[PDB]
């Protein structure tokens, strides 16, 4: 390697520790990488940023794909990569984003602890989640890990109350769930589906939508094997057990024979999404319910697409979705605590 080339690039290289104050401001601590709330040191920047230090060293397959896809993806409801820092000394990779004060895990927990304030909040959240996922799906990118903690919401600032989809599962070996919470997992995954699909993301959106309406995870439940008995039991307790006509291709699922060994139709004879949602004060003849039932369809080939869901007359009914999901109302949710 040429020495002048080397020292010139070293002289010019932006280092994360020079540009950003983040020490002691850790806010996420997952397996994929630790997240910090950061402030700009240089230009007296008022805005908050998120710095993700990617777990491990070097550039792993997952790190490469995440950088590759985030570098291209540009949509208002998908989290937006501002900058990548490559720290040569310790071989660490840092990703810079705009900071999202809130997320649906904390928003939903707040309501659950308190007992959807502005009447269009749930609807506006649902619409923006569908809009972001639709953009991913139209570019042949699956999320593969959708849950409330990965639906961020921007706080005070220019993008107030805007949904940002984050923490996409950008690397899965052979696009397989079988390679190294189950509450948001579609039934086909639990029966051994070999590949992630668009439909699997839509089921998860269905689950999130139910949780926003009720404040409770709809499929709440207590090895490398994809079959989870109690999680399937919870889905049938809520949805009922699927008839042959409801899911004809269930017989092709690798764990279908295991399902038949463990489960009897009779056990769930008085169970349905209608009855479940009625107990939580959601009307079965509401446009909200009818959309929800289209998202939580057991057969993935009968599941509604993101674009079709966005066209549902639910979003034409009063109140209309708003760009700021808080609708200009004062945000009562707490800021995130530092770790």
């Amino acid at each position: 390697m040429d020495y002048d080339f080397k020292v010139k690039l070293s002289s010019e290289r932006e280092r994360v520790e020079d540009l950003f104050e983040y020490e002691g401001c850790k806010v996420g601590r997952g397996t994929y990488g630790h997240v910090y709330k950061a402030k700009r040191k240089d230009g007296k920047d008022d805005k908050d940023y998120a710095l993700k230090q990617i777990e491990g060293t070097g550039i792993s397959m997952s790190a490469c794909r995440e950088i590759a896809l985030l570098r291209e993806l540009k949509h208002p409801n998908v989290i937006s990569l501002q900058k990548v820092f490559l720290s040569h000394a310790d071989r660490k990779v840092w990703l810079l984003f705009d900071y999202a004060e809130h997320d649906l895990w904390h928003i939903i927990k707040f309501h659950r602890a308190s007992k959807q304030l502005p009447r269009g909040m749930v609807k506006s959240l649902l619409y923006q989640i569908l809009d972001g996922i639709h953009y991913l799906h139209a570019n042949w990118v699956l999320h593969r890990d959708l849950k409330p903690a990965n639906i961020l919401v921007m706080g005070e600032g220019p993008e107030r109350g805007r949904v940002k989809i984050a923490d996409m599962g950008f690397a899965r070996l052979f696009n397989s769930p079988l390679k190294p919470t189950f509450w948001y997992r579609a039934p086909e995954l639990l029966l051994g589906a070999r590949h992630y699909t668009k439909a699997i993301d839509i089921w998860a959106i269905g689950c999130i939508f139910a949780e926003l309406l009720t404040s409770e995870p709809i499929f709440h439940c207590r090895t490398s094997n994809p079959y989870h008995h109690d999680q399937l039991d919870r889905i049938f307790n809520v949805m009922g057990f699927p008839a042959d006509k409801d899911w004809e291709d269930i017989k092709k699922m690798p764990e279908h024979s295991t399902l038949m060994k463990d489960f009897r139709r009779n056990t769930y004879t008085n169970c349905s999404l209608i009855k479940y949602m009625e107990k939580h004060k959601v009307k079965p003849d509401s446009k909200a319910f009818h959309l929800l039932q289209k998202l939580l369809t057991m057969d993935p080939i009968k599941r509604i697409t993101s674009e079709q869901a966005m066209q549902d007359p639910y979003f034409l009914e009063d109140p209309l979705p708003t760009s700021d999901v808080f609708a200009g109302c004062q945000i009562p949710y707490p800021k995130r605590e530092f770790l």
Partner: protein, 267 residues
């Protein structure tokens, strides 16, 4: 892998890595103090062949090999051959391109064994000594490559649109194998840095039609495209085949490699 497939017009490829031909020639003058124009083209051909053999040995699909080739050209589009040894850069490009795909992984030991084996069994005319770099050098070079490319990793190629065009013709059996092979050959030129891939696809399909005496004038007429640009690309393809004929890489490459400017050591 069809990730971002319909996004070319908002892609980093299009917006950052379709270069102006005069900017490209201006940056190349620093290496033209050491090598003639013909020698520089002969070098870029040689390293395209190195990357192809490495990718074939590792059993990667042609799109991955093409991506690795584009990374290499992008690096040397901006920097001198002396900045990092191209013997090290080639396998580093293949390695990084392989990690953009999720269907399997190239291990460290397999990458190194592949570079060592391919250079000795297939390129001993160019290189008298064994591949001297270890995995720590690949890992260091990968950081520099990712940085120069501004983390632009998704690359679009002519294979996908070619496939669509030949299916539109209803001439897959006759024209596809030849047109595909001409697409491969265009990577021996600067075309991937200068033109959108679909235009390269059309020019390759045109040459394939001429070689096989297939009249497709009416089909090309039904397209809404700048044909002057297509003819420009065809002219470069025909020029490559004349250079190919007059070039014996086996007889010439050891001499051309010795003329390359070499990386300066520290004091």
């Amino acid at each position: 892998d069809k990730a971002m497939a319909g996004n070319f017009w908002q892609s980093s490829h299009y917006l950052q890595w379709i270069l102006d031909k005069q900017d490209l020639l201006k940056e190349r003058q620093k290496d033209l103090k050491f090598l003639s124009e013909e020698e520089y083209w002969k070098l870029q051909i040689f390293f395209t062949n190195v990357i192809q053999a490495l990718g074939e040995h590792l059993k990667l699909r042609q799109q991955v090999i093409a991506t690795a080739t584009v990374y290499f050209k992008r690096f040397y589009a901006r920097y001198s051959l002396k900045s990092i040894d191209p013997v090290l850069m080639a396998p580093t490009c293949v390695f990084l391109a392989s990690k953009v795909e999720e269907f399997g992984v190239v291990s460290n030991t397999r990458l190194i064994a592949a570079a060592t084996s391919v250079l000795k069994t297939r390129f001993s005319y160019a290189f008298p000594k064994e591949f001297p770099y270890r995995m720590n050098h690949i890992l260091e070079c990968e950081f520099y490559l990712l940085e120069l490319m501004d983390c632009c990793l998704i690359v679009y190629h002519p294979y996908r649109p070619l496939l669509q065009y030949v299916q539109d013709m209803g001439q897959e059996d006759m024209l596809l194998p030849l047109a595909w092979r001409i697409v491969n050959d265009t990577y021996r030129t600067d075309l991937c840095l200068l033109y959108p891939p679909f235009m390269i696809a059309l020019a390759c399909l045109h040459v394939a039609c001429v070689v096989q005496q297939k009249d497709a004038r009416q089909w090309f007429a039904e397209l809404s495209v700048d044909m002057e640009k297509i003819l420009e690309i065809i002219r470069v393809i025909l020029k490559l085949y004349e250079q190919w004929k007059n070039f014996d890489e086996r007889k010439e490459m050891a001499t051309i490699l010795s003329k390359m400017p070499k990386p300066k050591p520290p004091p």
